[PDB]
Symmetry: D2
């Protein structure tokens, strides 16, 4: 279990006039996937994130290979690519679950942990709890 899975049934609001899913939604799903991971494996991070901790997204990207239709069942699999003192690089595989599974997109995010008054924040070491939650996903043993 080296990845976290977020499942989603595509809705009409996510489509555009061409009939497929508008590209922005793929980036939105990265955030949804990453926060559900926190909800299920490190809920304590919200209290921090509701306090003074901040998760700053340094980079967000997605490459698209195929299209998605309304009501396609999607599985976004998140993996930990790299964990540094203060940052985390996350990888996302987007699978359309059907008669057969199809990789419709692949993305990445780099996030930095930070604390301090808005405008006067500084990078902080990845919270111990989050590092523990990442245990099964870390390449390092």
């Amino acid at each position: 279990p080296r990845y976290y899975e977020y499942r989603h049934v595509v809705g009409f609001e996510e489509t555009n006039l061409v009939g497929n899913v508008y590209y922005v939604n793929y980036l939105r799903w990265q955030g949804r996937c990453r926060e559900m991971f926190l909800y299920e494996h490190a809920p304590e991070i919200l209290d921090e994130l509701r306090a003074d901790l901040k998760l700053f997204t340094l980079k967000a990207e997605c490459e698209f290979f195929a299209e998605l239709a309304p009501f396609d069942r999607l599985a976004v699999r998140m993996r930990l690519v790299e964990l540094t003192q203060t940052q985390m690089e996350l990888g996302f595989d987007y699978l359309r679950l059907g008669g057969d599974d199809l990789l419709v997109a692949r993305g990445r995010q780099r996030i930095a942990c930070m604390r301090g008054p808005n405008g006067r924040t500084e990078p902080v070491r990845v919270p111990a709890g989050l590092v523990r939650a990442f245990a099964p996903f870390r390449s390092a043993t």
Copy 2:
């Protein structure tokens, strides 16, 4: 006067774009890329809509953004777009995000790769970038 120009999209940050942290949720930066590129189309090649309603599709092959600072509600944003690369059937767009103030602060940089296609939704074949679009992007084409 023939120096490559950028197409500028200006936006005043609202509250819907902010999260509990107090700054702009990252997704909005990618949204603004689409908004910027479509307002460019609206102003320079509105006739592309008729094509987009028929069989023409602008398929985004890649979208990315790197973030350097924070944006707060009511901040004045300027998204500057340039055509950085044009092949037979694809276009690469560059986006520079600036917070307008005394000193314009670069808050992020983005990029998109788009492929032109025509065909039965699901049975699409690549097509050469529409002539009208190529001409429209001409003045905003970056050489470097």
Copy 3:
């Protein structure tokens, strides 16, 4: 079972600087709830909705009684208020599921079924399949 239930865990993107859920999201959940109802009870409507059928929202409204926080578990219960020849009035109860359940909002939508070229559409009788799917929700027997 006179209502359909859509469950959702509130995420960070749905909050604003004040820490609660931005009001627009409540209206978005009505659409999400109504389409998941279709997905589970009248999936054939998509094929129609991907063809020439159109669900035109004539009215959408929501009244707010309390606030919602990130990661609160929400239950949106949808009921059929009225079913006419061509229209449907839907009611939505928004419950925050916690130690105790709290009614945080209540909304309504009126939708009209229509067919025809965009700009030249006309109201059509509610599709037989949808009427059947509404059987357990109809006041009429």
Copy 4:
């Protein structure tokens, strides 16, 4: 010259706002109410932000919209807002949506009820509408 005026928010419809049907997804109309009301604040009472960051909260008690026509991508929209009612602690805003063309077509009408509050997030007490805000809305106050 003293006739009640409306505050106008103009928006060019984009592709993100459209659904597979080809018109604007209904949710966007409610979005535009917030956008319109906040741009009003930005232009007429920007200092409210400092209050919104501290303890002031604009709680939306009710939001509604009725739809009469369709809006397509690239349509020019005008959302006109008026203060329709002002009590000690609440405000009711009216929104008229028009598609701008030769003949401006009314495509929808909306309304919002907002309550002013201050206090520990969850332990909020109602407060009288801020003086600065009341004055800012003055010229856009509707009597009927």
